[PDB]
């Protein structure tokens, strides 16, 4: 397992490989870096871990052990 790229750090590297519900944004002069994308979300089969308050309006941070990580899930 490998980290990402930290917010307001730098996009030059890699946009592809920035992070999650980042994006790689465009300046003028100044060297531009990945950004949180507006409106940004999750949903039922991503990870929840870390973003048990990002997920999309209904998700929720589901705990799951035995079969895969900590995903995230619709209301119940």
Known sequence: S???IR???SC???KND???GLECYKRRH???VCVPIPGFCLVK???CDGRER???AGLE???RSGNKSSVCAPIT
């Open 61 to 63: 941070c589901w705990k």
């Open 2 to 4: 490998n980290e990402c």
């Open 18 to 20: 920035c992070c999650e």
């Open 54 to 56: 990002d997920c999309c």
């Open 12 to 14: 030059v590297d890699r």
């Open 45 to 47: 089969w991503k990870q």
């Open 30 to 32: 100044s060297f531009e």
């Open 7 to 9: 917010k307001w750090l």
